[PDB]
Design brief:
The structure is cut from a larger assembly and holds four copies of chain A (203 residues). By secondary structure, the first copy, chain A, is mainly α. Helix content of chain A is 64%, strand content 3%. The first copy, chain A, has a two-stranded antiparallel ribbon. Chains A and D meet through β2 and α4 of A and α1, α3 and α4 of D. Bound molecules: fe (iii) ion (56 copies). The site of one fe (iii) ion has 3 residues of chain A, from α4. Chains A, B, C, D: Keywords: Chloroplast, Iron, Iron storage, Metal-binding, Oxidoreductase, Plastid, Transit peptide.
């Protein structure tokens, strides 16, 4: 035996006490190890957060794709963001199953559909909405991370940091920069031009 | 003038009576022409049908992706079907905007999450569920088509026939054939083998 | 014999009663079958509609190609639209002969030549004119389709739906989006910039 | 000076107090910095854990490579797992030397050699054994991580998370899925078929 900063290390002897950690009933995960209910439930929450964000971005896409709005760069940007939030949800679903939890998909609420806001202009308002949405997803990611830290699940904390937190802060800066640019160019010709550059970036 | 089977043809003279059909208020679609509220609402219904079907297939994927179920071909099949139903929804959203209607995304209900059914076996039960889901989407597509026929919207009927109905009957035969094969191979080794062939088809 | 929803199916026996349906006089179409006078006349109307639309677009091209107007993207756009409307006319002429009708080209009226409209600006006014023209062609296409439905000519209805109606609604959305963009960018630098993007799209 | 959440930041001035942190005796590591004895000892434990796991997998390989067992896919799977556990040990040895600790290789115990288990069947029993072994290695990795957290060694925690924990949970799901599949296919033809698919995966 070895005790290292209070942590007991039992030496390697045999694989048999762990054979009891091989479940013998077919409805139970065999992979699950040190993956507690709180972390399972917090992953399920973040799946519903990302999916709802995907749906919200699809609603934004549907508005700017209107012929009388005609901001194709915005529409494509919001469509791709919807695809991305859904990929996040899917990656979290795969992770849940990798750790042996159960994915529990919840309801998705009606999102906002109209983004007609003449004072700021539709484009600036919607990009600010997108920024707020990303910050909301980031808050939930931080909640998820706090659960994982409290449960001493270091594989989960690293998963969240490496797979989601870094992309999240990069998405927020990018959209923040879009808001700043839209404020600088102003409504009308400036917005249209920004939209054309968005369309070119989106290839 | 020419009246042909009761249909009045006025000869081509000038483009001015149609300039009044160019809306001058910015919140109204300029494209909209002979696209009535019933067709707009029926497209919105089919968008919600396809999206709910996408969500249901994602829930199916999440179950078969479990380590204790371990039917990777099924999981991938259901994941791809979820992607496909979402693409259908998106194509219908694009169409709505092409015709000048408004996309109205509605709520998505909690789907079924557990497909543990020992008598039929999980694989056969889920493939039968998928078949029932496709038939449900086909019924809604037929409702949508009946609205378009009643409203004399021939571009919409052709759109529905060419873009969705043909794929729909092809999907149903494919999944029907999967059900038939799963019944023939039986539970256990047969199901696993069918799953391996599904995985190979899915590249 | 078989009667199916009221439709009499006589079984296949021989090809001789149809030899009388092989005309023996050289001025008559041998191909013509279930292609009635109303459909022949409605196709001839749509040929004259598309040709007049071609001529109108050529007049628009001739205005924006002026050195003091100098909107080359618009000029090229209207030139290509003129080519396209003429191709539609030609495709309808080919179809008329495929079905065994007679093409009857009618007169083309003097179109509008001056599009100097300072309040909206030449570019916005002309794009709205183009939108109205496309909607006028779409109305005639719907008249043509209604004749074909009433005459129970399903090959013709499908021809109209597949070859013209889908392109027509796509052209209308595209031009509607152009109108919306021109309103957003405003006269002067915005219009010129929109024109430059039109020129780039037109390769 | 700057104190930030209690953490003292002394400003950059010169490199001389750290020249005393350059050891002048040849038997001492010059690299070692903030790498305490508990972390050094915990790395040495995990090296012995991975090596023992390598040896156990080699014993498994040696059994299934027998002509009367003849499960070549299993034999190759266990051989490659043995190579992988040894690579883990080696990577941990390299890390120990990177941080300036001393690698201390310990004894390796006789592993189990016979895996003749007729009730479950040799293949299912051995795959469950492998699962238990991976879970045992994961427990030790968690012990190692807890030592590093307690000693505030963030480079070590990240090393463990990025290099080992993620692969570990992926290995466990993969082997869990193998157990589930072996249970589904059953002994005899099913096991042989699973073995053939294992052999194909292993290229
Ligand atoms: Fe546990
Ligand atoms: Fe637990
Ligand atoms: Fe795309
Ligand atoms: Fe993914
Ligand atoms: Fe659970
Ligand atoms: Fe559940
Ligand atoms: Fe509105
Ligand atoms: Fe935290
Ligand atoms: Fe990282
Ligand atoms: Fe990183
Ligand atoms: Fe950018
Ligand atoms: Fe400007
Ligand atoms: Fe540009
Ligand atoms: Fe930019
Ligand atoms: Fe109308
Ligand atoms: Fe209407
Ligand atoms: Fe894929
Ligand atoms: Fe699409
Ligand atoms: Fe509406
Ligand atoms: Fe609305
Ligand atoms: Fe269950
Ligand atoms: Fe119908
Ligand atoms: Fe078709
Ligand atoms: Fe077809
Ligand atoms: Fe197939
Ligand atoms: Fe069998
Ligand atoms: Fe196979
Ligand atoms: Fe097959
Ligand atoms: Fe006839
Ligand atoms: Fe006739
Ligand atoms: Fe040219
Ligand atoms: Fe042609
Ligand atoms: Fe004639
Ligand atoms: Fe003149
Ligand atoms: Fe003039
Ligand atoms: Fe009709
Ligand atoms: Fe068609
Ligand atoms: Fe079509
Ligand atoms: Fe365009
Ligand atoms: Fe300007
Ligand atoms: Fe430009
Ligand atoms: Fe453009
Ligand atoms: Fe130190
Ligand atoms: Fe020390
Ligand atoms: Fe090898
Ligand atoms: Fe190495
Ligand atoms: Fe030492
Ligand atoms: Fe022996
Ligand atoms: Fe033995
Ligand atoms: Fe820890
Ligand atoms: Fe990492
Ligand atoms: Fe990582
Ligand atoms: Fe695998
Ligand atoms: Fe068998
Ligand atoms: Fe095989
Ligand atoms: Fe396999």
């Amino acid at each position: 035996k070895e005790v290292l900063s209070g942590v007991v290390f039992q030496p390697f002897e045999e694989i048999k006490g762990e054979l009891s950690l091989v479940p013998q009933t077919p409805d139970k995960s065999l992979a699950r190890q040190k993956f507690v209910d709180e972390c399972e439930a917090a992953i399920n929450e973040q799946i519903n957060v990302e999916y709802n964000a995907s749906y919200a971005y699809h609603s934004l896409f549907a508005y700017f794709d209107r012929d009388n709005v005609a901001l194709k760069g915005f529409a494509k940007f919001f469509k791709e963001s919807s695809d991305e939030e859904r990929e996040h949800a899917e990656k979290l679903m795969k992770y849940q199953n990798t750790r042996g939890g159960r994915v529990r998909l919840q309801s998705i609420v009606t999102p906002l559909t109209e983004f007609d806001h003449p004072e700021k202009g539709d484009a600036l308002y919607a990009m600010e909405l997108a920024l707020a949405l990303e910050k909301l997803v980031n808050e939930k990611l931080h909640n998820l991370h706090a659960v994982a830290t409290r449960c001493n699940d270091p594989q989960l904390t690293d998963f969240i940091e490496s797979e989601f937190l870094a992309d999240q802060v990069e998405d927020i800066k990018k959209i923040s920069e879009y808001v700043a640019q839209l404020r600088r160019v102003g409504k009308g010709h400036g917005v249209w031009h920004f939209d054309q550059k968005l369309l070119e970036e989106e290839a």
